[PDB]
Amino acid sequence: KLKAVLFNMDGVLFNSMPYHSEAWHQVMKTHGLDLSREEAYMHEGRTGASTINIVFQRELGKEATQEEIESIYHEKSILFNSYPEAERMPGAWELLQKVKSEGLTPMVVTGSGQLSLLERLEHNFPGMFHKELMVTAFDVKYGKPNPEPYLMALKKGGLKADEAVVIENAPLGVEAGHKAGIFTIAVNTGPLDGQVLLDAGADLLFPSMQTLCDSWDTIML
Ligand SMILES: [Cl-]
Ligand SMILES: [Cl-]
């Protein structure tokens, strides 16, 4: 039944998670808030505004103001962009070529609003993605772990949930894919215990994008 493969971006397509976790950790530290690199990784999937608000609630016992959200989001984006630009996750391009050769539609479903990465998708993965077949921070009211972004991806692609598969590296994205009713494959590309991804609702778990790519033609959907 499979028609489309819905990829997260950060930690699936780009090896950008060390940078995102460093930048969140450092900007929060500047603001006097403790967020470890691993706790930052655990927020992958959220929009930046949702991350900031939840960290304020957890650490300060209050909501972030709109000004705090915009300031901190810009600060983190500027710091992220100050690093040498993120490179591809090994295995992603090989997998995309396989998916496309099988007649399947690649899509991106991300909580990112980071234009530096979004505008590099075409040069990194030529011929794969299209803006009207992507969901980003710009498209959603509620991001991951709410199923909204994955539900929206299904609609953009004219798909039913049973015609798609989700490829996720982070538990909030796994949860969103699963709760959207879509079969969800976790790829453990970061510092987390794989069990965190299984417990978030992943139907399958692979230890890298390359191993997923190697097994791809035996996943019968
Ligand atoms: Cl990382
Ligand atoms: Cl960013």
Side-chain angles (χ1 to χ4, degrees), residues 33-153:
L33 287 84
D34 290 317
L35 179 74
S36 73
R37 294 161 182 91
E38 301 73 41
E39 293 173 314
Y41 198 108
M42 292 286 290
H43 288 292
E44 166 55 24
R46 300 192 201 278
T47 66
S50 178
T51 300
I52 294 157
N53 191 53
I54 292 172
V55 171
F56 267 59
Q57 174 263 294
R58 287 176 182 174
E59 294 310 303
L60 294 172
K62 62 173 183 175
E63 317 269 63
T65 70
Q66 219 48 49
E67 287 67 38
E68 289 168 330
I69 286 164
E70 296 299 322
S71 293
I72 293 162
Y73 180 94
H74 280 280
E75 221 179 321
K76 185 261 165 170
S77 179
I78 291 161
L79 183 57
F80 175 87
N81 275 329
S82 77
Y83 303 142
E85 70 182 5
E87 294 184 340
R88 292 179 293 278
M89 186 60 69
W93 173 237
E94 192 186 347
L95 178 60
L96 280 161
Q97 289 166 289
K98 280 187 175 299
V99 161
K100 192 186 179 174
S101 182
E102 286 174 356
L104 302 172
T105 302
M107 300 181 74
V108 181
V109 183
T110 178
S112 180
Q114 181 46 262
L115 296 169
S116 79
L117 290 173
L118 294 165
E119 294 182 350
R120 281 177 64 223
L121 284 167
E122 178 65 28
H123 284 146
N124 282 274
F125 309 102
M128 293 299 164
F129 302 115
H130 298 275
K131 65 169 164 189
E132 294 292 346
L133 292 167
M134 291 171 55
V135 176
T136 71
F138 298 109
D139 298 304
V140 299
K141 183 176 180 32
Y142 311 112
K144 303 169 189 181
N146 190 271
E148 175 176 335
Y150 280 110
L151 294 174
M152 192 177 326

Side-chain angles (χ1 to χ4, degrees), residues 1-6 99 104-107 159 163-166:
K1 279 186 190 151
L2 191 68
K3 293 181 174 181
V5 182
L6 287 40
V99 161
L104 302 172
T105 302
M107 300 181 74
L159 294 153
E163 293 172 327
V165 61
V166 170

